[PDB]
A paper describes a structure:
The structure of the KtrAB complex revealed a homodimeric membrane protein (KtrB) assembled with a cytosolic RCK octameric ring, formed by the KtrA protein. KtrA binds nucleotides, ATP or ADP. ATP binding induces the adoption of a square-conformation by the octameric ring and increased K+ flux activity through KtrAB; ADP binding results in a non-square conformation and decreased flux.
As a control, we also analyzed the impact of mutating A80 since substitution with a bulkier side-chain was expected to cause a distortion of the nucleotide-binding site.
Residue numbers in the entry:
A (entry chain C), B (entry chain D), C (entry chain B), D (entry chain A), E (entry chain G), F (entry chain H), ...: 8 to 222
Amino acid sequence: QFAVIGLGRFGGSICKELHRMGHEVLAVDINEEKVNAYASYATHAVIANATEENELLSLGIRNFEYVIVAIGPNIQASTLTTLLLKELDIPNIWVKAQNYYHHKVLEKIGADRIIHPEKDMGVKIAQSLSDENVLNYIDLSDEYSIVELLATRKLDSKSIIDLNVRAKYGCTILAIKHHGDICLSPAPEDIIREQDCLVIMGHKKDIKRFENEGM
Amino acid sequence: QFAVIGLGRFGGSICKELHRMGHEVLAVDINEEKVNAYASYATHAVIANATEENELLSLGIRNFEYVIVAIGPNIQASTLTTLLLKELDIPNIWVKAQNYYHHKVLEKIGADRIIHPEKDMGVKIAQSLSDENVLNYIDLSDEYSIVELLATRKLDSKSIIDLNVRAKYGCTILAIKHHGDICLSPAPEDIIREQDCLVIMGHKKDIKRFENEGM
Amino acid sequence: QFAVIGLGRFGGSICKELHRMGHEVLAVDINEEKVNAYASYATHAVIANATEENELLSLGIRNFEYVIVAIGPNIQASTLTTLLLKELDIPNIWVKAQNYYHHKVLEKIGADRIIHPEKDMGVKIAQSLSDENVLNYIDLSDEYSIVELLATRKLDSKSIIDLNVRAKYGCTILAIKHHGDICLSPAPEDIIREQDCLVIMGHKKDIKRFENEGM
Amino acid sequence: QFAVIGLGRFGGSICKELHRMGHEVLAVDINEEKVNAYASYATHAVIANATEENELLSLGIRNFEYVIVAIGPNIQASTLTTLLLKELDIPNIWVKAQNYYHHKVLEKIGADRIIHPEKDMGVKIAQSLSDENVLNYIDLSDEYSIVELLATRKLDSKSIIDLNVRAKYGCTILAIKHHGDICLSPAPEDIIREQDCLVIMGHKKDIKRFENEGM
Amino acid sequence: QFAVIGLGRFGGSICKELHRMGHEVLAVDINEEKVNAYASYATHAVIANATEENELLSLGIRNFEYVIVAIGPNIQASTLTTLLLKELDIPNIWVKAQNYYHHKVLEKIGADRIIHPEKDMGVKIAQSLSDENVLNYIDLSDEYSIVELLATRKLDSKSIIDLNVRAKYGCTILAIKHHGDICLSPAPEDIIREQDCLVIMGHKKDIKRFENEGM
Amino acid sequence: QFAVIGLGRFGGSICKELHRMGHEVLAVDINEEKVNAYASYATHAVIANATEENELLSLGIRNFEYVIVAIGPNIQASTLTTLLLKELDIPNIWVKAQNYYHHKVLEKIGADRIIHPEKDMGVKIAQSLSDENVLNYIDLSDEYSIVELLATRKLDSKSIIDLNVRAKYGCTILAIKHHGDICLSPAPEDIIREQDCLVIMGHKKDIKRFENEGM
Amino acid sequence: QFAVIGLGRFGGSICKELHRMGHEVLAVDINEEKVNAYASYATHAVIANATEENELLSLGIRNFEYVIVAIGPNIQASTLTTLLLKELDIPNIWVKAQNYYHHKVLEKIGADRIIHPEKDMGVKIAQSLSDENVLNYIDLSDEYSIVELLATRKLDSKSIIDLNVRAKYGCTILAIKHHGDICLSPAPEDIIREQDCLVIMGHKKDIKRFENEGM
Amino acid sequence: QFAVIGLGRFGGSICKELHRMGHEVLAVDINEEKVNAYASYATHAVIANATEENELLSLGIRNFEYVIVAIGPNIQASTLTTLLLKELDIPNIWVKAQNYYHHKVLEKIGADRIIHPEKDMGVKIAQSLSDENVLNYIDLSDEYSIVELLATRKLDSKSIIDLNVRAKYGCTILAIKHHGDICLSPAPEDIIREQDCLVIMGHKKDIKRFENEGM
Ligand SMILES: Nc1ncnc2c1ncn2[C@@H]1O[C@H](COP(=O)(O)OP(=O)(O)O)[C@@H](O)[C@H]1O
Ligand SMILES: Nc1ncnc2c1ncn2[C@@H]1O[C@H](COP(=O)(O)OP(=O)(O)O)[C@@H](O)[C@H]1O
Ligand SMILES: Nc1ncnc2c1ncn2[C@@H]1O[C@H](COP(=O)(O)OP(=O)(O)O)[C@@H](O)[C@H]1O
Ligand SMILES: Nc1ncnc2c1ncn2[C@@H]1O[C@H](COP(=O)(O)OP(=O)(O)O)[C@@H](O)[C@H]1O
Ligand SMILES: Nc1ncnc2c1ncn2[C@@H]1O[C@H](COP(=O)(O)OP(=O)(O)O)[C@@H](O)[C@H]1O
Ligand SMILES: Nc1ncnc2c1ncn2[C@@H]1O[C@H](COP(=O)(O)OP(=O)(O)O)[C@@H](O)[C@H]1O
Ligand SMILES: Nc1ncnc2c1ncn2[C@@H]1O[C@H](COP(=O)(O)OP(=O)(O)O)[C@@H](O)[C@H]1O
Ligand SMILES: Nc1ncnc2c1ncn2[C@@H]1O[C@H](COP(=O)(O)OP(=O)(O)O)[C@@H](O)[C@H]1O
């Protein structure tokens, strides 16, 4: 169902995680050591030169609905492999881009999805660092978002009804994680202790306001 | 306030994004072309070898609360710089890891946060790939998460009270995005049309169950 | 001014002819024997892998306004070379296509002109053999053309005013070549002897008619 | 009437085009897929080894006036087949040459015409390259020729009587192609717009002069 | 009397051996180093392209009764030269064949003898591996042959009258070579010691029988 | 029992002939086309790189008593393969040599037999040329040999007792092949007709004498 | 007393030699074949992952005064192990360095001695190549050294009092090795024959002078 | 004058040092990063596969008197390179060996010197560790050596005439290094302070005795 062509920092992780989720994955790599190392982290693992189409045919690459092209240092191999896969009518081809150029040519040669892993992780890191409180988040839209927060001393021993976010800031608390224990959709009587995870939901500026005055 | 030591695919993105957000960032790089290219995407841009202590002193690296070590292909510059920075009492040192090892030695030499961009983006892509429906998500913990979904035909013209997720699956719907318009914490009378964004919250396996039988 | 990347049956001819015309041409080839053989048929001759970018940089390939990619047996090397050249902002990139696919991908990766030598030669030869008389020709458009013909016995000792092509077929005679001697824009009194070259100009179907009934 | 022995890039084109012109063609090929692919582009299509005499006899190869030997990568099949055909008293044997040698031995073993498709296409393209404007041409002799030109801005909105080529350069304009529309033997009042096709006729050097000072 | 056109692994050996036997040989080669190296192993040695007729005339190739064409890597030079030699009415033309094809076209263009050295050496080596004992042999017919054998322990100190091959196996012993000393048509009293050469003559199967039970 | 590692002009013939004799042979070749072509001419045929040890182990090369290493274009692969086989304690390793050097290094790395096909065939052809008559022969020693001759008119209708070779020249007639029919150890009354095969045995110079005066 | 953690080209030799000298050594390796191979060349041999702390504790690694970290293929095992050992208060940790980096991080994480085997052996061999005569040497300081020299013809049959190095060049001869026989601190009457070992001692530039004018 | 084929831990150091000494060195490497990194540490630096003969010819490798083969991970490439160099009549070929086997085969294919760097460093460390005083040493022969020592407290304020090594142990003191200052061939009145460098010369076992009872 899934094929990973490059078993490196990026593709190897995709393979390992897909395998961990319970899906069947065929891992490909030109380097024998990589193939051997991911033998336990994949349904099948094969040594093959991705630059030769007949080898791809030998892999039975057409039997897959999703083929992942994760070759980083070599743009040549990346775009060429993507091309060969595009020849074989692969339904979905996802390729890692190195730069603007790579993104462009992959875009033109019919890549289904082009990923800039470092960049996207970068915006995650940037938002996570800009305000020390947010551990993680998800953007529902340009204006609205759900935010995971690290409780400070200002929130210690404070109740949900005490911190009336639903009216004063128009945001809503979703979950509280305390010492690994978790509380989903907590009742107003619940207490928030410091260093705990607080899951708020609402408008970005409003969340920023609550962060400002509340914590 | 923030310093980016490696201006590559990863660090360059962090610098550019931080600059876009309005924060002041000092970009460092041993390659002159990189420094020149990021002159417009940073408050200041300097050519310097991060492995040389006197150069670090010349940068005024101690004046920063956050220093990001993002050097990928060469572990040398990364761990050595991290070490030198740990000597200079940098409050927060965030470093990009290449493998299990890099993570280990960074962990022991006092790295405040170790990032595996390819790995985490890898698992994100993996989750996004396992189900085409999930557009984005956030993990509250090892077991609990909030998931953004792309509504299918099975969910078309269905009401929230019709899809009783709060009891049948123990999950809760948070938001519905329809043609760009957005509905936060929607009432049970609200209708979900296909191709819309559906924000569910709960246990991973339970959300998967709802995905299986519901949509 | 001109660069030939593949010194084979096709590209080698381009190089040799361009050199014969008096233009300065840099010939490239991965095969040393080929490079040696075309040393006398080029301003400069270099051994280089067209698939390696730095080698292209070493060639000073950017200093050329026209670079010809003539690699036949390997589609990989062809599209790859075209790609690398497209990176280096080469003004005009002309590439040999092997098949429909090759034409497509070259088209998408920004090839300025795509040549099917076999095909065009095929149609030229097809028109040349279909009619025993046609020695050569040029197509002005999809419908109109100028045709060179070999005079038969039916045309022997016939005058231009006798063979009134300007009215009977709407075509015009341009030149008559007799025993090597040549007559341009001949007067109606001129005589056409057999085995001579006759240059007619007009519509294809009309020329075919004149061929059918006249000669 | 016509037989094509090699259905490749070259011979396949000859077969397809000949079939398109309305002539009856028998296509031969050692490869079954090729034979199948040209079933629709030929009167008949047969699987046969051109190096085997009895197979040639089985084809009824003697019933043809023109047999085309187009086998490229393998000189063996080409010269051997040509030889067998010369034995069977084939009226016209046309063979594709790979190099100087192939031309030589085909010449000696009684080939009626030896074709270097890449070479001639090469010189055609070469003349097309020396001047960007010339789209096509025909040489009447060593000194005289008819040339098709691409009108530049210098020729825009210019009349034929304005560009007095018949006296100033001794050349004559034959046709003007404007937006696909075509004008044969145009009157001096006619206007030439840029990017149009201009058909001049005369001496090579004179045409070059007109190209130089005029456009 | 003898001319060697290709001074390689094959032709060079022929030249050297013919020269060693006392015959006068003219060695030809396009490579100067070869010509220099075979100067001492030939009556005369000349640098010449065997594909050029005027050079062949300059060699005085017609003055030779035997001309050997030994060019391996290039089928071109071989068949073309053979052709030119056939034009010049050379009495005997012997050419080395590369494959079935080379044999075919040489056969048709009037080669006096076509040699497949590797192949015939192949059957000799095949017999040499098939039987541990035979040092050399000659086939009189499809069924009858003369065989040279290496004496084993089973033949040590055995007399000819002891090994009655003329009646028991119907074969006849011809010669015995002992420590370089040689005995032709030996008398029945003669002794055969091990590691000596034994020359038997008769039917193949019978010789095999004698090998089986005797030695 | 027998393994052929290089399926070319030399090794392929060894394989084919060994197979023809009825022995079981495993053919190896890195080129798939070669392996396919010799599938019918071998017990088993495998695609394998002879320079790779694990592949050799996969072949079960140790199960063979005779392994033939025949490499023409690449001396490296030859000596390396011979080396690996010598490591695996192969009883008999026979290798084709390209030159003196190759012979030396093969000699030192423990090659069991080194064959120069061109050389030996060269001297055989040389003796075949020295005398137009000799069809075949075998050398018993440096001075003594058995020779096969093509009878001329001088020997026509001559009896063995008429041509007293046993006394006048000290050589002995062994066999006469007459119209394909064969006579072994013929009686003195037997007649020799021209164009028949005559098998003489004796001293080289004496045989030459008999050729001189007799035929 | 001594523990060798990596049994490769470097560490294996250390273990074998230390064992040969009579010291007790515990050899460690993650590879079972290596551990088995060095069972006879060590007091004890154990299979263990040097990156796993509990395994190190199981080894009783604290009971050793000297632990050698020689792991080649990856910096990971080396620095991580060195780190763990520095944690466990190992008295002496000597580690093989891969590059400048490895040296740096080992230096900072408290490595007692960092070895560049290739670097030092490389510069020694380099000295052996720059001057063919010097077989070996040792540097007492930046300026002074003892050098072993290979006697040339210029030194043949020369006496020590003849070559007054102690006064003319300020260097002193220490030993003369002749045909394996050795003379320590030789008297001025002793003779030096060519191809013998000559042990000089003094200033580098002075030794170079003596080499220049003397030999 | 010197060529380095492998720019790794070993060969790279040789190149750098040879360049540092003032000699001209041509550095070769199949990896571009290595070639670029050693551009400043060599007269010339080239990307080339050492296993390809024509590339070696292109390098002008024959123009060198010394060619160093330093390729570690691939024994194949090593021996093949050594082989090709042996073909080109290179005067001196020095190769790094990986193991006993490699040493053997390099020995047989005509390697001029075979180096095991790690082994020698291993034995050096082995001698250096039993007694901390030995910093370094040199073996004059199997039995005799010169040793550099670190003076202990037992040697503090002791005179040369006090420590009569020339008679009691048969060894001779050569030099004393005190605070960086150096004394060559010191007089018996000279004093040795602890932790100073003491250069002894004599028999290995005797030196060991002196170390045991004396220091
Ligand atoms: N030509 C090729 N064919 C097949 N696989 C390749 C080729 N080139 C590189 N790879 C594989 O791609 C991987 C690249 O990994 P890496 O450089 O870490 O990229 P990323 O950072 O995207 O993971 C390597 O593990 C390598 O085995
Ligand atoms: N010692 C050093 N000092 C300063 N900058 C360095 C040093 N080593 C590497 N760099 C810089 O770090 C950058 C690494 O970027 P890149 O390889 O793209 O990392 P990633 O792939 O993680 O984005 C390079 O542009 C380089 O200039
Ligand atoms: N990667 C490459 N880099 C440079 N030159 C190449 C490469 N691959 C092939 N070539 C050259 O291209 C030529 C191919 O010529 P050929 O196959 O005859 O094409 P055509 O039939 O169009 O002339 C060869 O001579 C070869 O040397
Ligand atoms: N012996 C043969 N008999 C018949 N057809 C052949 C023989 N050998 C080759 N062919 C055909 O000739 C074609 C060669 O085409 P190709 O190599 O593309 O030539 P070119 O490059 O000149 O177009 C192949 O499709 C093959 O099927
Ligand atoms: N056109 C030619 N004219 C003369 N000599 C030639 C020509 N072409 C090749 N040769 C010679 O033939 C030799 C080929 O030898 P080789 O390849 O070893 O053949 P073989 O393996 O049959 O001995 C080369 O040394 C070359 O000098
Ligand atoms: N490294 C290798 N491993 C295995 N087979 C090889 C290798 N290199 C070449 N070969 C095979 O050897 C054959 C070469 O045969 P050829 O050059 O005809 O030798 P000969 O002239 O002795 O017949 C090729 O068909 C090729 O498949
Ligand atoms: N994590 C580990 N724990 C223990 N031993 C290891 C580990 N990783 C590698 N080794 C051993 O270290 C040895 C390294 O040898 P080698 O690669 O030759 O290094 P070098 O070239 O520095 O001598 C290998 O034999 C391997 O068995
Ligand atoms: N086939 C090859 N041709 C040329 N250079 C090579 C080849 N294979 C490896 N190399 C080079 O040899 C070097 C190997 O060095 P390394 O593995 O560090 O050995 P060592 O540690 O003994 O120096 C690498 O830098 C690599 O670029």
